[PDB]
Ligand binder design. Structure first.
Ligand SMILES: Nc1ncnc2c1ncn2[C@@H]1O[C@H](CSCC[C@H](N)C(=O)O)[C@@H](O)[C@H]1O
Ligand SMILES: [Zn+2]
Ligand SMILES: [Zn+2]
Ligand SMILES: [Zn+2]
Length: 430
């Protein structure tokens, strides 16, 4: 009997361990599904999604003690209790002074899971959490310093409720979480939480992936976006594919300690249109383009480093100011311009500026369709946000066509039967 039908763990030369197909997979086929080994709902989604299964529901039942955890019913409340009990009493005593980061909360859950279930779980048929790479020999002082900060926050918020292995074991575990952890996003790509999917973490990266990972609650699903032939390695993308090769590889080296050698990284075919420049009387020289690219990459890094504390109004002003400055060299289709429009659209949605959000979406969609792969979650989500804006602004004709473009991608990535597709189809009917 096969551990996972038509698939196998294997050794990928120069890429450690990986996943290979044994039988052919065609576009849209489900390779495998993997239940979360551990997961945690993001703080911002408390009250809107079930803390246990991540279901989006109205009328979730709150925990009577803390009144901070919300569930579908008592069954989801009972399932989550071994994890929620580590935080319940702490959330009552300490107010909003109880603030461990998402990584610290997820790691506390892995520690609790390892204690009760030391054997391999149904989520570890190919790769177990204990086998995860950590790359501790490669970590920079900054990443080593964040691991130590996370360990101290783990003792501070969980010492009374969890028994810890030694410090070295905690350094290994937080390093494994950084290298193998996932984030779960909804149908609009909004962040829902963090999770460990050991069998999904076995797949190596490519910027030309042959699979896409989607979520059905906290169940990860892996679907083919091209033919996967017997003997082919199964590759997913670890990062956002919008960016030029250099940006992608600096991100990959920083978080995963490797340089990608996929076809896109080798040919660099899409870089020219990704860094589109405007046709001026001049036009811009290499040095002026390099200066604006360096500037944009720094704004993106700064936006990333300050995300947690900056208000949506401060986030909007930076976007508008950066877009205005870059527009002297860059075309609107340039990825750095798209970065600011996407963030700025995000703020328009937050402040219920539906018309402002739509004007941004209208400019992002065509360049997104060109820059991303043919089957892209980013492209499907953008068509979906566009469609929802149009429907809300009474443009049923434009909304329906935009929702159908989303559905066409989602049928391949999420499967034809996904609840997201059923929800979108219901929105078309009403
Ligand atoms: N395209 C690629 N080239 C080289 N190493 C890669 C890679 N994709 C992923 N990896 C490696 O795999 C790590 C993530 S976890 C993925 C499976 C890993 N090969 C293992 O043996 O456990 C990365 O940190 C990096 O070591
Ligand atoms: Zn639930
Ligand atoms: Zn509680
Ligand atoms: Zn690549």
């Amino acid at each position: 009997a096969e551990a996972r039908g038509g698939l196998e763990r294997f050794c990928s030369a120069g890429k450690g361990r990986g996943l290979r197909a044994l039988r052919p997979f065609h576009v849209g086929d489900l390779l495998f599904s993997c239940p979360a080994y551990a997961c945690v709902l993001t703080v911002g989604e408390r009250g809107h999604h079930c803390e246990c299964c991540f279901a989006r529901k109205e009328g979730l039942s709150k925990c009577g003690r803390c009144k901070q955890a919300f569930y579908c019913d008592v069954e989801c409340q009972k399932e989550d209790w071994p994890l929620h009990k580590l935080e319940c009493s702490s959330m009552v005593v300490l107010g909003e002074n109880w603030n461990p980061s998402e990584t610290v909360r997820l790691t506390a859950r892995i520690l609790a899971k390892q204690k009760i279930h030391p054997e391999r779980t149904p989520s570890e048929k190919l790769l177990a959490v204990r086998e995860f790479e950590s790359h501790l020999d490669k970590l920079d002082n900054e990443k080593k310093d964040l691991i130590q900060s996370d360990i101290a926050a783990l003792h501070q918020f969980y010492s009374k409720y969890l028994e810890f292995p030694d410090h070295s074991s905690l350094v290994v575990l937080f390093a494994q979480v950084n290298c193998n952890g996932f984030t779960i996003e909804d149908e609009e790509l909004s962040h829902l939480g963090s999770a460990i999917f050991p069998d999904v973490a076995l797949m190596n990266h490519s910027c030309c992936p042959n699979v896409i990972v989607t979520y059905k609650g906290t169940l990860a699903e892996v679907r083919a976006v091209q033919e996967i032939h017997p003997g082919d390695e199964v590759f997913t993308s670890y990062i956002d594919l919008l960016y030029p090769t250099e940006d992608r590889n600096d991100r990959l080296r920083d978080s995963y300690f490797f340089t990608c050698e996929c076809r896109e990284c080798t040919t660099k075919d899409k870089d020219k249109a990704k860094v589109e420049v405007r046709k001026l009387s001049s036009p811009p020289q290499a040095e002026a383009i390099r200066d604006m690219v360096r500037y944009a990459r720094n704004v993106i890094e700064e936006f990333r480093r300050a995300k947690h504390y900056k208000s949506p109004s401060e986030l909007l002003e930076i976007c508008e100011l950066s877009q205005e400055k870059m527009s002297s060299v860059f075309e609107d289709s340039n990825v750095y311009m798209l970065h600011m429009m996407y963030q700025a659209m995000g703020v328009c949605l937050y402040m219920q500026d539906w018309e402002g959000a739509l004007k941004y979406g209208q400019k992002i969609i065509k360049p997104y369709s060109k820059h991303y792969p043919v089957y892209s979650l980013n492209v499907a989500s953008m068509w979906l946000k566009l469609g929802r804006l149009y429907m809300g602004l009474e443009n049923k004709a434009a909304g329906e066509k935009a929702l159908k473009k989303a559905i066409a991608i989602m049928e391949v990535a999420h499967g034809k039967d996904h609840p997201y597709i059923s929800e979108i189809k219901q929105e078309i009917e009403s």
